[PDB]
Design a protein around this nucleic acid. Structure first.
Ligand SMILES: [Mg+2]
Ligand SMILES: [Mg+2]
Ligand SMILES: [Mg+2]
Ligand SMILES: [Mg+2]
Ligand SMILES: [Mg+2]
Ligand SMILES: [Mg+2]
Ligand SMILES: [Mg+2]
Ligand SMILES: [Mg+2]
Ligand SMILES: [Mg+2]
Ligand SMILES: [Mg+2]
Ligand SMILES: [Mg+2]
Ligand SMILES: [Mg+2]
Ligand SMILES: [Mg+2]
Ligand SMILES: [Mg+2]
Ligand SMILES: [Mg+2]
Ligand SMILES: [Mg+2]
Ligand SMILES: [Mg+2]
Ligand SMILES: [Mg+2]
Ligand SMILES: [Mg+2]
Ligand SMILES: [Mg+2]
Ligand SMILES: [Mg+2]
Ligand SMILES: [Mg+2]
Ligand SMILES: [Mg+2]
Ligand SMILES: [Mg+2]
Ligand SMILES: [Mg+2]
Ligand SMILES: [Mg+2]
Ligand SMILES: [Mg+2]
Ligand SMILES: [Mg+2]
Ligand SMILES: [Mg+2]
Ligand SMILES: [Mg+2]
Ligand SMILES: [Mg+2]
Ligand SMILES: [Mg+2]
Ligand SMILES: [Mg+2]
Ligand SMILES: [Mg+2]
Ligand SMILES: [Mg+2]
Ligand SMILES: [Zn+2]
Ligand SMILES: [Zn+2]
Lengths: 69, 120, 114, 149, 91
RNA sequence: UUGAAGGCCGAAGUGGAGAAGGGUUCCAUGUGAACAGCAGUUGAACAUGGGUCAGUCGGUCCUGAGAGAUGGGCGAGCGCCGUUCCGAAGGGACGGGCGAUGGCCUCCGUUGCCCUCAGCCGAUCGAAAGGGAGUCGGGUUCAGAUCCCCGAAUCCGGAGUGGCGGAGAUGGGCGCCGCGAGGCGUCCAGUGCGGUAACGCGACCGAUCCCGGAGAAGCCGGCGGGAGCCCCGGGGAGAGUUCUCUUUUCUUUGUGAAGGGCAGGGCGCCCUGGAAUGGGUUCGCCCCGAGAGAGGGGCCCGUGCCUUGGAAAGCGUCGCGGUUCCGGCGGCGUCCGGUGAGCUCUCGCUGGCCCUUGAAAAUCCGGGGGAGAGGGUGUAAAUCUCGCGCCGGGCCGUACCCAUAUCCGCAGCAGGUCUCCAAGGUGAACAGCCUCUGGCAUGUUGGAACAAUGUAGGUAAGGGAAGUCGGCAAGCCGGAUCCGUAACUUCGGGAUAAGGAUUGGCUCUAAGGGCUGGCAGCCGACUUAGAACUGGUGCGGACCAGGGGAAUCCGACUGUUUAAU
RNA sequence: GAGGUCCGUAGCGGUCCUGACGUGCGAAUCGGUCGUCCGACCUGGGUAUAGGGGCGAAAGACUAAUCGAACCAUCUAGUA
């Protein structure tokens, strides 16, 4: 598993061809975006809710998004 | 029940001549006691030497004395240090007073000689 | 306490059958089977007892996966001989060649004299 | 194991191809690591060198003597043993040698020999104090120790 | 303090093997466990690794020598005689 | 069989799991003819059906002690010796040349021939405990799980067009145009950079050949670090007791592999500098003009902590449903600290012992060399141990028992049979004795009585070896602390010689240390010594636990020996 | 903190009671008491040595419950 600390590189990873799905974890104090590529699971961790939601809309349209609880 | 008895034993009960099976060495090893005391005394000497209460030569001398087992506790060693410091300070003060008097005599003689030469 | 068992069909405390204890996310204690501790390369000089520096100490067949920079150092005889003996070898070669030149020129001088 | 004398591992360079050859000698006493040992007919005479017995002067002390030319050393190769070059004979090229058993032998004067005594001397002067020491001494050699009358 | 009168290193053998054997092994024991000065560096770091093999802890230099002593009188006299023989041979 | 009660095993187990061996004994359903030395509604019995899933656990591969072909020799002969010895013992290869072929005949590949280069130590077998890359967590069955499902990884091999990206690698000079920014033409360089250094950065060309390392190692002692377990002080959640007391007693209170970072360890690594008034330093040592103390760095390990994984899962509790068929739905919680000559495991340093020096090989890597190759300034080329992407990993083993009932002894036989894990108290202690987790039903039967004789335990007045071949047997002594200790002697021993005193409970006193800022504050952990009181003189209260002395004979001693007199 | 060092667990062995049993639990076991317990130590697996041979710290000991010459078949319905 890998942790991505930047946002636009995570966006590139999401637009990668091997990306099968993105799953959104909403826990207290945190929001995590997990992209499932061929080899690694990439996690982007951000602590701001409106940044999280704008990123959620900014995610690519053709990739299966799934929020989980 | 067990920890009631342990509280009693920490106050010191149930630990007399009758209730002891192993040797004194078996219960508390003398090597462990010696090693503890060595660590305590080495640490005190190092703290004193780094805080400048004593100098390197005195430190080395009573370090070897500690290894040679002339001090039994921490306090005995620090009192010996106090006595050594007092004696060293007094001897130094006497030496400085004497050498100041000697230097006065020497430079007064030199000044008298140079004014004699100025006369001649 | 919880006292536990092996996980393989080898039940002897041999060199390959070494384990460590780990607490799992299921709140249980298990054996994991550790890897044998590797060694850094020894210097080719044959004199220095110490190991080389800058080289990963791993079991030898693991060195295939490593990159080259994690296996050697940037110097002549990098990762195969220590710096001290490298510099003594350089100095020895140079001074020996100088002495050889000196003896050759003295031989030529003696031949001229005779 | 099983031998009193230590062995000296020595590296020569092959004169016919680009290689280095490693060999084991019966270490003459006084040798040390980093030393240069010289092999051949006209190497000078000092401890550790090997040269034919027909060239060395009489009275020379020798170890690892070669009983026939080409045999690569057979005689006087136990810890502390040596042989003595007694006399020469140029015609018929033969040399008299005194062996560590007190015997005298006639040897072809063109077989090599190491200069010096074999290292590890004085080993039999220490008493084995116990059957355990004797047992371990003979365990590294062979199964013959606990002898029965 | 001094803990024994006669027996030194052979105090570890107790009352065994005989007084004469213990006496004649004492000096060899001392000789083989002594530290000798290295002729190559000047430090006293010469240990007997195995029988006949002496090692310097600082030089990392290894010498072939006696079984219990660093060198033997036979070795030294042979060395001197060989030096004299070479001197005579080259005149 | 279920429930309750009373007991035992007592963590070197009557517990949980494997190897050899067994071979379906494993699981379910049914039966009670035979068997399980009584009986049976039960069974390892009988009858029906079920049950063992792998690139990442082992075999397969390597070689060891050894075994074993061919050449050769011997042999009436089946055959034997022999393992490098009396062999023309190689069928491989970079490259160059020739000849053909396919694919857009480009360039390569298949080849066919020639030139050139080429030691193997001998075919082959030999370890399910040695060597040997790479898988872990949760859930799931009646019986299978590192094998199934879910989720996270990882190794090896392959890949014309390399699938992409990044590196190579993209600069300088001169001359024009342009106010400049910037652009056009000529030339020339370009198989990577940083640090004084130890070394570092994500790559960072290179063949036959040579050199080295890892694989690759004894036993014992001491010390240090890291875990797991145990212990202590408090928060929760749930249970026990509550005649009186107890802010009480008990249970429980998670985070893998693989990456990143940081502690914490180790350095016989580097730089400045030059030390006697010798200094540094350990439990011990040990170190220094061959460069110490003091400053500043570098490298290795990193099983510890935080983090991605990760809370979504697990667990503990409370509550709703599905009256069910539920990886159902929900709430809540999964906390904060301290200690230790503690026990086990592991990592590291250092020392001792040897007339003992404590494996090989497969395999992988680094270095030295420089035969060669790539492109002429670009849309760059050869080449990449860099980051992702694509495909694949065959064959065999896998159930269960493992031992007072699944093995050998004719048997459910007090015998024998190789290992791993290991709680509380007492205590020197893995001793003995009691308990918790887990297990069990007293060992191939029960009931009523308590004669003799037995077997195994005990106690006896007075005497104390008078017994008997013979103190056989039993008995006396026993731990620890404080005194004290002879003859003799190989001066090491004898020696716990011999002989005495003390030992409970309770209440105190003194001494023995850290951290922070000759002082002050805050923290502690176990020990030793002394005193008062006190009990029907009783205290190593059970358990554990040396009788001693004076001589003679023999063998110096430790060791071994007639499995079954 | 040395020692083929002492007391003493596990292990290894087998003294004495000439105890138990002696158509046994058992074709060599059981109890108490014992010896040693860092070494000439104990032990699995692999491997070598085969019968007038092996191996033996030596008792004619062990060599599959068999040993002062193993076991199997045959000569053999051997001879008295
Ligand atoms: Mg193995
Ligand atoms: Mg490196
Ligand atoms: Mg023998
Ligand atoms: Mg069991
Ligand atoms: Mg079980
Ligand atoms: Mg069954
Ligand atoms: Mg019956
Ligand atoms: Mg053969
Ligand atoms: Mg094989
Ligand atoms: Mg294997
Ligand atoms: Mg963890
Ligand atoms: Mg320094
Ligand atoms: Mg949860
Ligand atoms: Mg080069
Ligand atoms: Mg199984
Ligand atoms: Mg009974
Ligand atoms: Mg019963
Ligand atoms: Mg039974
Ligand atoms: Mg009586
Ligand atoms: Mg009486
Ligand atoms: Mg009588
Ligand atoms: Mg009578
Ligand atoms: Mg008796
Ligand atoms: Mg006596
Ligand atoms: Mg007499
Ligand atoms: Mg005897
Ligand atoms: Mg017998
Ligand atoms: Mg002993
Ligand atoms: Mg003993
Ligand atoms: Mg007997
Ligand atoms: Mg009897
Ligand atoms: Mg009877
Ligand atoms: Mg024979
Ligand atoms: Mg024997
Ligand atoms: Mg016969
Ligand atoms: Zn070196
Ligand atoms: Zn030296």
């Amino acid at each position: 598993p890998r942790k991505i600390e930047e946002i636009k590189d995570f966006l590139l990873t999401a637009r990668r061809k091997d990306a099968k799905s993105v799953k959104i974890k909403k826990n207290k104090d945190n929001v995590k975006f997990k992209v499932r590529c061929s080899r690694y699971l990439y996690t982007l961790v951000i602590t701001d809710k409106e940044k999280a939601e704008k990123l959620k809309q900014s995610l690519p349209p053709g990739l299966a998004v799934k929020e989980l609880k | 029940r067990c920890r009631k008895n342990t509280l009693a034993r920490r106050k010191g009960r149930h630990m007399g001549i009758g209730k002891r099976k192993g040797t004194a060495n078996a219960r508390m090893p003398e090597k462990v006691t010696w090693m503890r005391r060595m660590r305590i005394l080495r640490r005190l000497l190092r703290r004193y030497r780094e805080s400048k209460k004593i100098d390197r030569h005195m430190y080395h001398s009573l370090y070897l004395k500690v290894k040679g087992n002339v001090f039994k506790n921490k306090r005995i060693l620090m009192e010996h240090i106090h006595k050594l410091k007092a004696d060293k300070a007094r001897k130094k003060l006497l030496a400085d007073q004497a050498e100041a008097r000697r230097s006065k005599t020497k430079e007064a003689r030199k000044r008298r000689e140079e004014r004699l030469q100025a006369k001649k | 306490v919880q006292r536990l068992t092996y996980r393989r069909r080898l039940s002897y405390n041999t060199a390959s059958n070494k384990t460590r204890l780990s607490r799992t996310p299921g709140n249980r204690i298990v054996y994991l089977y550790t890897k044998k501790v590797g060694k850094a390369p020894k210097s080719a000089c044959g004199v220095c007892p110490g190991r080389l520096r800058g080289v990963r100490a791993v079991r030898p067949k693991v060195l295939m996966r490593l990159s080259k920079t994690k296996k050697h150092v940037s110097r002549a005889y990098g990762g195969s001989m220590c710096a001290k003996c490298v510099r003594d070898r350089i100095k020895r070669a140079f001074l020996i060649e100088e002495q050889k030149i000196v003896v050759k020129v003295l031989k030529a001088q003696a031949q001229s004299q005779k | 194991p099983g031998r009193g004398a230590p062995l000296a591992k020595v590296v020569f360079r092959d004169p016919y191809r680009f290689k280095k050859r490693t060999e084991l000698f019966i270490a003459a006493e006084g040798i040390h690591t980093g030393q240069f040992v010289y092999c051949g007919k006209k190497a000078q005479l000092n401890i550790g060198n090997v040269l034919p017995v027909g060239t060395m002067p009489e009275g020379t002390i020798v170890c690892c003597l070669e009983e026939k030319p080409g045999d690569r050393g057979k005689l006087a190769r136990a810890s502390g043993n040596y042989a003595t070059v007694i006399s020469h004979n140029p015609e018929t090229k033969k040399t008299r040698v005194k062996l560590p058993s007190g015997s005298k032998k006639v040897i072809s004067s063109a077989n090599r020999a190491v200069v010096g005594v074999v290292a590890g001397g004085g080993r039999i002067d220490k008493p084995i104090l116990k059957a355990g020491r004797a047992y371990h001494k003979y365990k590294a050699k062979r199964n013959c120790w606990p002898r029965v009358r | 303090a001094k803990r024994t009168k006669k027996v030194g290193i052979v105090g570890k053998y107790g009352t065994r093997y005989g007084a004469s054997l213990r006496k004649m092994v004492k000096k060899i024991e001392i000789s083989q466990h002594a530290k000798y000065t290295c002729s190559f560096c000047g430090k006293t770091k010469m240990k007997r690794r195995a029988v006949g093999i002496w090692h310097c802890g600082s030089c990392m230099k290894t010498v072939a020598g006696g079984a219990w002593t660093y060198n033997t009188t036979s070795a030294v006299t042979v060395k001197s005689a060989i030096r004299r023989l070479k001197e005579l041979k080259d005149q």
